[PDB]
Design a protein around this ligand. Structure first.
Ligand code: U10
Ligand code: HEC
Ligand code: HEC
Ligand code: HEC
Ligand code: HEC
Ligand code: PQQ
Ligand code: CA
Lengths: 108, 723, 433
């Protein structure tokens, strides 16, 4: 680069393991993945609409901070936070949203 | 004639050095003038050349045009005056007679930000939504059109007002509108500059049922933007927002039209779109084809916007050595607090860094440019109060920013006004003639009581409320220098070839600074605050620097008691011009403002709480928070209407003052709620009358600095890493 | 020193209201040409610019003094009593000198030719005018009267009977069209109302509560003179431009002295034109008018601004119950202000610039006559007489809205802002209509 400097590299531990993310966090992750693509509009939308309704992620009057934590790149698993805005390749961002879809499949 | 547009293009390459033909003096909107008659070693000798008193008592934000010696300036209530640019004598005037019953359908004052010139005609938009062309010489009406289509969806609530400056590209007048603060569907329309026929239209948000609108945005809306808008939410009824009211750029180098798309409607992301989707073409920059209006590219600066972070701020085009190679780029400083450099041709994201303090994101993604949201910033999803910096007024606003190629610096007037965001209790509830933001109106606003929580909140708000001017260096993406001010809401910037930058301050001072180190060089008291950007031009061969002065806008209307931290000011609207050998002087004026009057002593306590609530949702937007006016509109505490139930209802419920801007509120409030508002106002007046009278008791007759909360001792410029 | 003298002369000229009646509508300042109606014919204001041919450029100090104090031109003929020289005869020597300096140096010389009066030759002779001054204008000592012990009251009396000429409008005129009293020693006729001048009536300035300033406070008078908007009155008609052109430029000391002198005048008998409101009119208007034509017109056109009890809004909409302008015997000014509205700029204590619409086109003559009768006999008002449609139609032809142009010249206050159109679906009638 050495042009007008780019934004600094983000800090966090990327990962595609979705063992104990818990609902309304996978729903947030799929909200992050339906936008910006990396999965689809047809196989990610059924997960988002159905994971946020069965487990009441939004509810229009309720909180669930776990939705916001996941609308960004963050998700918790086994007492550890992983960041999806890492994985600068953008090909690891994909197959991580796909992994999230796979993990949400038994949840629905 | 001269084939206008060719002249405006040549204005970027040294042609027409003494004219201001466009909103930003050129199609690049750099607001840089090659006139060096007034320079650093000389500007200190500047004197007032002439002045002209305007016939309005509200804010003046217009940018006058100057064509070969005639100044066309648009004023409040969308009035237009053509004056002699050398002597300031009124050549002619025109007023479109904007109806007074729509004044409450505009977010923030009845302002007019500018006009356009083409082929011997001057074009401007009226506050009620009309585009009008007049003969540049005689001032007679050529044509007038209504820019809001009667058909199409536009949502159930259609609060459309026009206050921005139109731009003309290849003989096509481009104009947008505003009103997403109330609920509206944003679009930009291009009309023929000669006959007024509608050439094309571009909708910035998809229609509720994904059906064709017959416009030029159909394909991109039905194929790309619609899937990003939830599945069912308040955007189908309110409109979705995305109004284009400030920025409308034409680039002849790339032959494109750049639109700065505004915030969503309602602000509440969960209410608007279930908290799902990117809400495409919302808070973004959209470049389209100037001929057919077809979409070319886009860049979303603020996905899932919920803090009123509009991308409508000024868009500028420069040439920079990107990666050691010259490249035509777009620079942007929107409300969210990030300076963006993107590619003008393809729209590719190049870089972005915060030019002021922001706590809603940990920078941007280096690979996409999407913000790295902090989870707590999405208050709508978390359902918890969020202290957002920048607030709803953003780090940058309609105030113009300038560029200097001599110093290669971008001068930005920046501000810091935090806001507490919290969702509206009980779910979304849209009100007729009220701000349908979808947030809690009880949580916003400050109090003057003795509650320790309120005292701490007010102290913190005054601590982190700031205003300054930053000389950003795009090559380094770092501030070269800063000029501090007492408070926010100052005027725009103007840069000339004499290495001098001009700006009007909120305390009523017109200032000229060095463009290399920011040293103060010239100061002049204008008897009223300046919120409009200065322009410079030549007449009869000599250079003039002119600006419109007048106190107004959303900030004094809303923040009230804390809106005068920069110093005491009232509204004395006029247009002033300085020359190197001016010999004029401003006549004295009354600066007492609205003085207190003793109120009635009887009020009901049981109607206090809800009454306050109602005042915060219907009347706070114009008469100030906590019933304290900012100095432009009447203070309700000293008004004679709240002295009785019948008079108060006939003024508020029936709109007895509709001819001046007070519209009826019986379409959204029952008489009991209006009576509750009256009781709250009476209680506030009884609480604050003695304090206001004591404050105004001094030699000058205006409240002292301590009462106005002006900041003694200089405050640090925020920058990143700290407020 | 010369600049100070020019400024003092300008202040005295504004104090004497020279510019208001010596400028034609949309004309050069002090260039004359204003049409002044007279029972004999129509007179025109002479230009008083320092122009040596048209104006008074060749006038010496002695000629200026003779013209002001005795109404004698440089020619030697006597001016018409349209010149307030009976009142200007009280001007002190210093004030006359300052005004002479201001008019010879501070005024831009305009070259407009004085229009001749359009009076038939037998009645256009100028010799009888001097006999009028001899018969009806007594000799007056120039300056402050050396009999009032209080200096403030003496200054106020000098202002009222000197530079300012209130008796020209507020004092009834006798058979010779002369004021029946030039001072408070004349009797109860001093400042006791007047005949309609330009279809406007100046009410009594005496102590009677129904029509005079009996219910007015000294601060009320000061604020009304300074800005024209108090919580129980609002300026209009000829007073409007008297305040806009002359009185708003007075110093606070001068206004306070004038108010003190006005309040200190000898007591005058009370009138019977005002009574006690028992709520009958308010109940009638709350019902809906129920067959009263005046009540129906008031409800559909006027009750929105002036309330059902005729009290209006403090400092925004003046009351109609107990208002002396609505109370006076002659209803000419009432129908004039109903037919033609009035725009008032915002003040420090009265914000939100207000505007009466002119109802000359919205209502017919019968409707406006009915509403005038209703307001004259409502909320305890006991004004005498009845107004017919013929009087309304006479007033609609001979009459025009006030200029509202003096509010926007050389003033520290706000401009008189014109009102925006209400809209396509606006109505003053209530929702039930
Ligand atoms: C036989 O006697 C007669 C004469 O005397 C020999 C007279 O000359 C006259 C003439 C005398 C008069 C015209 C009466 C004088 C009355 C006044 C001067 C008071 C009314 C005038 C005003 C104060 C209003 C003027 C204000 C204006 C027009 C400026 C405002 C403009 C905006 C008459 C009638 C007569 O009968
Ligand atoms: C912005 C569109 C406004 C909103 C929202 C409210 N008011 Fe207002 N008000 C506004 C203006 C521009 C004016 C001035 C009118 C003029 O003649 O210039 C007013 C005036 C009033 C008044 C009159 C005060 C007086 O004259 O002393 C009152 C009593 C008043 N407004 C009340 C009021 C209330 C209760 C509101 C909430 C429902 C409210 N206003 C909202 C502009 C705007
Ligand atoms: C309106 C009632 C007037 C006011 C107030 C003042 N003047 Fe006047 N003036 C007025 C008229 C109608 C006339 C002419 C009458 C006629 O006989 O034609 C005048 C005349 C003069 C003159 C004489 C000039 C001449 O005719 O050559 C002078 C010098 C003059 N007026 C001066 C003057 C001054 C100084 C005033 C303030 C104190 C003033 N006038 C008040 C009408 C009115
Ligand atoms: C003729 C042009 C006038 C002269 C000279 C003066 N006044 Fe007057 N005044 C005039 C009218 C037609 C009216 C009617 C009411 C109005 O408000 O339109 C008035 C009224 C007043 C009042 C108010 C009386 C009331 O409301 O009951 C006052 C206090 C008053 N005028 C004072 C005043 C003084 C002090 C004057 C000498 C400088 C004076 N007026 C001259 C018409 C005319
Ligand atoms: C709101 C727009 C009004 C309506 C409707 C009516 N009136 Fe009014 N009136 C209004 C104002 C703001 C004022 C002030 C005077 C000024 O110069 O602007 C007035 C004045 C009057 C008066 C004069 C009394 C005085 O000025 O003290 C009268 C007699 C009056 N108004 C009567 C009146 C009637 C009969 C109306 C129904 C046709 C009416 N007004 C309507 C405001 C408004
Ligand atoms: O969402 C909208 O439609 C909309 C419109 C406008 C406007 O039209 O000026 C503003 C805003 N929002 C807004 O949030 C804001 O801070 C603002 C300030 C101003 C101004 O003129 O000073 N307008 C607006
Ligand atoms: Ca907004």
């Amino acid at each position: 680069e050495q042009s007008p400097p780019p934004p600094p590299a983000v800090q966090g531990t990327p990962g595609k393991d979705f063992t104990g993310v818990s609902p309304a966090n996978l729903a947030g992750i799929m909200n992050y993945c339906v936008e910006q693509q990396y999965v689809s509009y047809d196989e990610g939308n059924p997960v988002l609409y159905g994971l946020s309704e069965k487990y009441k992620a939004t509810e229009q009057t309720v909180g669930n901070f776990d939705y916001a934590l996941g609308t960004a790149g963050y998700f918790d698993s086994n007492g550890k936070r992983f960041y999806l805005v890492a994985y600068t390749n953008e090909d690891d961002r994909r197959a991580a949203c796909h992994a999230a879809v796979k993990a949400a499949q038994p949840m629905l | 004639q001269e084939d206008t547009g060719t002249a405006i293009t040549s204005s970027d390459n040294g042609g027409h050095p003494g004219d201001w033909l466009s909103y930003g003096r050129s199609y690049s909107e750099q607001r840089y003038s090659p006139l060096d008659q007034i320079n650093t070693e000389n500007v200190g000798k500047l004197k007032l050349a002439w002045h002209y008193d305007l016939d309005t008592n509200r804010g003046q934000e217009g940018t006058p045009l100057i064509v070969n010696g005639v100044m066309y300036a648009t004023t409040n209530w969308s009035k237009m005056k053509a004056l002699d640019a050398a002597t300031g004598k009124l050549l002619w005037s025109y007023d479109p007679k904007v109806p007074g019953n729509i004044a409450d359908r505009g977010c923030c004052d009845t302002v007019s930000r500018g006009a356009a010139y083409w082929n011997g005609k001057v074009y401007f938009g009226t506050f009620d939504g009309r585009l009008i062309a007049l003969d540049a010489k005689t001032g007679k009406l050529v044509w007038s059109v209504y820019t809001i289509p009667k058909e199409a969806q536009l949502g159930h609530q259609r609060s459309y007002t026009v206050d921005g400056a139109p731009r003309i590209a290849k003989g096509k007048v481009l104009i947008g509108n505003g009103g997403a603060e109330f609920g509206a569907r944003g679009f930009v329309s291009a009309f023929d500059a000669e006959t007024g026929k509608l050439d094309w239209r571009f909708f910035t948000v998809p229609n509720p049922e994904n059906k064709p609108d017959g416009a030029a945005s159909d394909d991109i809306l039905m194929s790309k933007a619609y899937p990003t808008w939830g599945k069912n939410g308040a955007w189908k009824q309110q409109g979705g927002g995305g109004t284009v009211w400030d920025s409308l750029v034409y680039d002849p180098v790339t032959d494109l039209v750049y639109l700065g798309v505004g915030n969503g409607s309602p602000w509440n992301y969960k209410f608007r779109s279930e908290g799902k989707g990117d809400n495409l073409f919302l808070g973004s920059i959209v470049a389209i084809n100037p001929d057919t209006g077809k979409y070319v590219w886009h860049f979303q600066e603020t996905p899932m916007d919920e803090w009123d972070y509009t991308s409508v701020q000024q868009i500028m085009t420069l040439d920079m050595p990107v990666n050691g190679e010259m490249r035509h780029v777009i620079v942007h400083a929107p409300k969210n607090g990030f300076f963006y450099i993107i590619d003008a041709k393809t729209g590719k994201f190049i870089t972005g860094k915060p030019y002021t303090y922001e706590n809603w994101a940990n920078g941007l993604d280096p690979v996409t440019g999407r913000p790295n949201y902090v989870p707590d910033a999405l208050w709508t999803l978390t359902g918890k109060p969020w202290l957002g910096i920048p607030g709803e007024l953003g780090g940058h606003n309609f105030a113009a920013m300038a560029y200097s190629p001599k110093t290669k610096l971008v001068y930005i007037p920046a501000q810091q006004i935090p806001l507490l965001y919290d969702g509206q209790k009980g779910g979304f509830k849209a009100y007729h003639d009220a701000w349908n933001l979808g947030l809690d109106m009880n949580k916003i606003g400050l109090f003057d009581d003795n509650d320790p929580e309120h005292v701490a909140a007010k102290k913190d708000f005054l601590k982190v409320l700031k205003g300054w001017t930053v000389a950003w260096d795009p090559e380094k993406m770092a501030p070269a220098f800063t000029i501090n001010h007492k408070g926010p809401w100052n005027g725009g910037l103007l840069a000339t070839a004499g290495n001098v930058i001009f700006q009007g301050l909120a305390n009523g001072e017109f200032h000229a600074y060095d463009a290399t180190n920011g040293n103060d060089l010239y100061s002049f008291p204008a008897q009223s605050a300046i919120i409009a950007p200065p322009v410079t031009y030549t007449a009869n061969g000599k250079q003039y620097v002119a600006v419109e002065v007048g106190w107004g806008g959303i900030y004094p209307f809303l923040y009230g008691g804390v809106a005068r931290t920069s110093g005491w000011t009232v509204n004395h609207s006029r247009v002033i011009a300085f020359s190197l050998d001016g010999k004029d002087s401003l006549p004295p004026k009354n600066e007492l403002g609205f003085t207190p009057v003793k109120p009635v002593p009887t009020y009901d306590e049981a109607r206090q709480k809800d009454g306050y609530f109602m005042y915060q949702t219907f009347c706070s937007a114009c008469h100030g928070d906590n019933a304290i006016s900012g100095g432009v509109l009447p203070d309700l505490r000293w008004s004679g209407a709240p002295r009785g139930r019948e008079s108060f209802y006939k003024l508020v419920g029936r709109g007895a003052l509709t001819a001046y801007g007070m519209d009826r509120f019986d379409t959204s409030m029952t008489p009991e709620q209006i009576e509750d508002i009256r009781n709250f106002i009476v209680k506030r007046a009884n609480e604050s009358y003695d304090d206001e009278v004591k404050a105004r008791e001094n030699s000058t007759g205006v409240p002292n600095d301590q009462f106005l909360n002006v900041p003694q001792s200089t405050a640090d410029v925020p920058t990143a890493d700290h407020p | 020193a010369d600049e100070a003298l020019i400024k003092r002369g300008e202040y005295v000229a504004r104090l004497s209201d020279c510019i208001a009646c010596h400028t034609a509508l949309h004309g050069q300042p002090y260039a004359g040409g204003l049409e002044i109606k007279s029972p004999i014919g129509t007179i025109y204001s002479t230009n008083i610019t320092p122009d040596p041919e048209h104006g008074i450029g060749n006038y010496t100090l002695e000629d200026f003094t003779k013209a002001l104090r005795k109404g004698i031109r440089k020619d030697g003929a006597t001016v018409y009593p349209a010149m307030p020289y009976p009142e200007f005869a009280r001007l002190s020597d210093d004030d006359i000198r300052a005004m002479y300096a201001f008019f010879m140096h501070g005024v831009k010389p305009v070259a407009l030719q004085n229009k001749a009066p359009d009076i038939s030759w037998p009645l256009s002779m100028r010799w009888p005018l001097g006999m009028w001054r001899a018969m009806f204008v007594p000799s007056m000592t120039p300056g402050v009267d050396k009999s009032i012990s209080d200096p403030e009251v003496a200054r106020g009396e000098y202002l009222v009977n000197g530079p300012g000429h209130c008796g020209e409008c507020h004092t009834p005129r006798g058979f010779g069209m002369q004021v029946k009293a030039y001072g408070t020693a004349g009797g109860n006729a001093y400042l006791a109302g007047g005949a309609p001048i330009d279809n406007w009536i100046a009410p009594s300035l005496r102590s009677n509560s129904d029509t005079g300033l009996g219910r007015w406070s000294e601060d009320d008078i000061v604020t009304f003179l300074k800005s024209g908007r108090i919580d129980h009155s609002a300026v209009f008609g000829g007073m409007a431009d008297v305040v806009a052109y002359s009185t708003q430029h007075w110093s606070d000391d001068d206004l306070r002295a004038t108010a003190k002198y006005l309040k200190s005048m000898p007591a005058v008998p009370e009138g019977k034109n005002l009574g006690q409101d028992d709520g009958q009119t308010t109940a009638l208007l709350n019902k809906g008018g129920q067959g009263n034509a005046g009540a129906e017109v008031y409800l559909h056109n006027c009750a929105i601004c002036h309330m059902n009890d005729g009290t209006g809004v403090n400092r925004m909409f003046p009351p109609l119950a107990g208002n002396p302008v609505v109370i006076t015997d002659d209803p000419t000014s009432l129908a004039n202000v109903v037919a033609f509205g009035g725009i008032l700029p915002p003040t420090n204590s009265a914000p939100s610039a207000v505007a009466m619409p002119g109802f000359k086109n919205h209502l017919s003559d019968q409707e406006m006559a009915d509403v005038v009768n209703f307001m004259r006999k409502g909320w305890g008002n006991n004004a005498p007489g009845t107004v017919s449609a013929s009087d309304i139609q006479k007033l609609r032809t001979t009459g025009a809205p006030v200029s509202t142009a003096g509010w926007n010249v050389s003033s520290k206050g706000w401009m008189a802002y014109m009102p925006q159109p209400y809209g396509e679906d606006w109505t003053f009638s209530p929702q039930t209509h």
